[PDB]
Amino acid sequence: MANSKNSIFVGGAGRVKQTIEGLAQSAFKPGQLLARAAGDAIDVTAKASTTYGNEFLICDDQPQTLGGGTDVAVTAGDTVQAISVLPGQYVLLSFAATQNVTTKGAAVASNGDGNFKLGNPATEQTFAVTEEIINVTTAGTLVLCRAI
Amino acid sequence: MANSKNSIFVGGAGRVKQTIEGLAQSAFKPGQLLARAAGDAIDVTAKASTTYGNEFLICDDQPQTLGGGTDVAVTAGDTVQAISVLPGQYVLLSFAATQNVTTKGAAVASNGDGNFKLGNPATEQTFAVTEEIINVTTAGTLVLCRAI
Amino acid sequence: MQRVDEMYRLVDSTGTGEDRDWGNQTLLGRLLSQAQTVSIGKKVIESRRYSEAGRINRSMSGQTDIDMDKTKSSYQKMVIPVFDGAYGRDFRDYEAMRSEMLPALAEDSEEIEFTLLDDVNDYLWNGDAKLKVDTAVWGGLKADASVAAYSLGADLTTATEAQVVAELLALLDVLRITNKKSGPFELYISPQIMSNWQKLAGANTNGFMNIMAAVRALIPEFSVVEADSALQGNQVLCSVVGTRGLHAKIGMMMSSYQVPRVMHNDPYQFVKWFAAGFQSNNSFSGLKSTVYGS
Amino acid sequence: MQRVDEMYRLVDSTGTGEDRDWGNQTLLGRLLSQAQTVSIGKK
Numbered sequence: 001m002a003n004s005k006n007s008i009f010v011g012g013a014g015r016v017k018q019t020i021e022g023l024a025q026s027a028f029k030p031g032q033l034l035a036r037a038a039g040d041a042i043d044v045t046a047k048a049s050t051t052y053g054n055e056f057l058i059c060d061d062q063p064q065t066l067g068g069g070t071d072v073a074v075t076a077g078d079t080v081q082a083i084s085v086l087p088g089q090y091v092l093l094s095f096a097a098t099q100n101v102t103t104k105g106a107a108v109a110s111n112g113d114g115n116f117k118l119g120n121p122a123t124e125q126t127f128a129v130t131e132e133i134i135n136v137t138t139a140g141t142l143v144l145c146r147a148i
Numbered sequence: 149m150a151n152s153k154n155s156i157f158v159g160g161a162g163r164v165k166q167t168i169e170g171l172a173q174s175a176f177k178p179g180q181l182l183a184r185a186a187g188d189a190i191d192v193t194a195k196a197s198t199t200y201g202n203e204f205l206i207c208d209d210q211p212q213t214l215g216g217g218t219d220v221a222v223t224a225g226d227t228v229q230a231i232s233v234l235p236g237q238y239v240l241l242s243f244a245a246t247q248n249v250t251t252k253g254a255a256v257a258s259n260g261d262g263n264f265k266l267g268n269p270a271t272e273q274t275f276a277v278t279e280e281i282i283n284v285t286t287a288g289t290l291v292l293c294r295a296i
Numbered sequence: 297m298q299r300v301d302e303m304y305r306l307v308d309s310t311g312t313g314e315d316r317d318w319g320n321q322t323l324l325g326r327l328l329s330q331a332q333t334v335s336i337g338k339k340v341i342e343s344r345r346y347s348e349a350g351r352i353n354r355s356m357s358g359q360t361d362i363d364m365d366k367t368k369s370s371y372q373k374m375v376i377p378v379f380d381g382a383y384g385r386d387f388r389d390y391e392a393m394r395s396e397m398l399p400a401l402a403e404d405s406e407e408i409e410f411t412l413l414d415d416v417n418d419y420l421w422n423g424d425a426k427l428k429v430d431t432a433v434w435g436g437l438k439a440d441a442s443v444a445a446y447s448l449g450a451d452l453t454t455a456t457e458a459q460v461v462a463e464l465l466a467l468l469d470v471l472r473i474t475n476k477k478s479g480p481f482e483l484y485i486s487p488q489i490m491s492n493w494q495k496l497a498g499a500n501t502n503g504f505m506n507i508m509a510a511v512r513a514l515i516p517e518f519s520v521v522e523a524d525s526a527l528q529g530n531q532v533l534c535s536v537v538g539t540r541g542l543h544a545k546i547g548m549m550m551s552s553y554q555v556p557r558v559m560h561n562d563p564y565q566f567v568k569w570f571a572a573g574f575q576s577n578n579s580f581s582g583l584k585s586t587v588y589g590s
Numbered sequence: 591m592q593r594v595d596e597m598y599r600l601v602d603s604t605g606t607g608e609d610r611d612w613g614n615q616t617l618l619g620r621l622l623s624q625a626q627t628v629s630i631g632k633k
Contacts, residue, residue, distance in 0.1 A: 212400075
């Protein structure tokens with residue numbers, strides 16, 4: 001595989017990431033959309049797809065010295081290190097099933113389950129823009145996208 | 149007070165601010181929403197809450213060597229040094245009355261008077277995102293918010 | 297010089313800030329002076345504790361089968377978090393204040409450094425339940441499960457001289473009797489009691505003596521008896537310090553640096569950061585070593 | 591040492607012993623210091 005996908009923040013050689021720490025509530029996989037809640041705990045979003053004003057908050061992969069990878073799920077009830085995405089960076093998202101990415105530059109909406117999808121940019125908040133031409137069929141595949 | 153609020157731009161230790169100079173028209177307080185007008189003069193916005201496309205332009209505190217603080221109002225008809233907020237920085241805004249901030253991450257809309265409020269992110273432009281759990285009752289209190 | 301509308305006032309901008317407290321960082325000043333320095337990156341520090349073991353046979357001649365046994369081991373966990381803080385001014389201001397010789401920068405480096413240690417002092421007495429690696433929370437010196445909780449009966453702010461020593465030995469006997477610990481102890485008081493330990497001792501009549509001088513003679517096995525403002529009211533704390541009791545491990549010592557300026561109007565910024573962690577001892581059988589009074 | 595799955599635990603090997611009692615062997619510490627030494631075999 002010439003496109004190795006073992007780091008969820010691949011967005012330039014001079015751009016550092018912005019980290020939002022917090023507590024866990026469930027066991028999600030790295031690369032999914034999050035939403036902070038009451039107390040100081042983070043979990044999956046579970047908001048509607050047609051709701052604006054959400055912050056671009058994805059789950060960073062955990063450190064190598066804590067048993068973390070791009071497919072290892074997080075341990076519940078602990079400190080999950082996340083990423084707030086600035087506009088103009090590339091990040092590996094995680095799409096849903098049965099959608100093909102044909103052109104580099106389509107709009108990336110947010111599904112209600114914590115994954116992303118190609119939606120019409122007239123009724124949902126556009127988070128990012130596609131940057132890789134692949135076709136996915138299993139829910140949970142990593143697709144490169146630019147956050148602008 | 150462990151949360152000292154005597155500088156309106158607290159947004160990281162490596163991020164510098166973007167400054168928009170201009171003339172004054174009124175005597176506003178630092179931390180309010182502005183809007184540039186004809187000539188080269190700045191004042192309070194006085195646009196509707198349900199209007200998009202506005203630039204994130206808040207009033208920086210004036211320099212220490214000109215009688216400036218986080219509560220000292222500006223002198224009218226002079227050079228007001230302001231701040232254009234890039235996405236991904238924390239700034240001290242100024243909210244209106246009778247609204248409590250419970251969860252870190254709510255949407256920050258703009259009231260018509262030059263202050264901010266927690267509005268529904270479906271009919272107004274979302275400027276920033278809350279970052280402090282406090283309850284305000286007097287209009288003109290400084291609340292930390294991240295500009296994404 | 298001055299103008300003519302300002303010849304009625306003379307000024308002196310020598311400046312004087314605030315005074316901190318009374319007995320502010322007496323405990324933390326002793327822990328961070330006896331601390332062991334580990335490398336940064338080590339988030340969890342495991343210390344081993346072993347047991348006691350043995351069998352003894354006896355006879356009158358000396359020819360019997362001699363038995364044998366060996367010692368077990370167990371482990372204990374702490375955690376090392378990182379603290380940080382920064383400060384900074386703009387460009388037009390600091391070039392203006394350089395001319396007047398008002399410092400305004402070195403009198404900030406001596407000011408954030410006090411507020412930096414205040415949250416460590418907050419962490420030591422109140423552990424935030426959001427730095428946990430596997431099971432190595434800290435919880436704080438007044439809510440931890442590694443700290444013996446003992447409820448006081450008599451209020452030490454209004455009691456006489458006799459009820460003080462009668463209820464200070466009942467605190468020390470949760471370290472000599474029901475927890476089997478020995479060695480030199482230390483005692484820490486709230487200032488609402490250290491002030492009220494100056495009233496009249498009713499027993500001694502050879503003049504006037506205070507209760508505080510009746511504990512620095514009656515209980516000689518006490519290394520220091522100081523005040524610390526983290527407690528408040530009717531609360532005390534007695535424990536052991538050193539490597540066998542309450543101890544601290546420093547990840548990275550307190551260092552400071554300046555964010556470099558690129559353009560001509562880059563604001564001045566400085567950063568101070570620090571990393572250390574705390575844990576009270578616990579023997580292999582499970583005998584605690586710190587008592588927090590009420 | 592230190593499998594790279596963990597590599598985050600400074601495991602120390604000191605031991606930190608086990609404490610005595612306060613008044614464990616005070617009497618026997620005085621008897622065995624003033625004792626007379628006889629030869630073995632004398633029962």
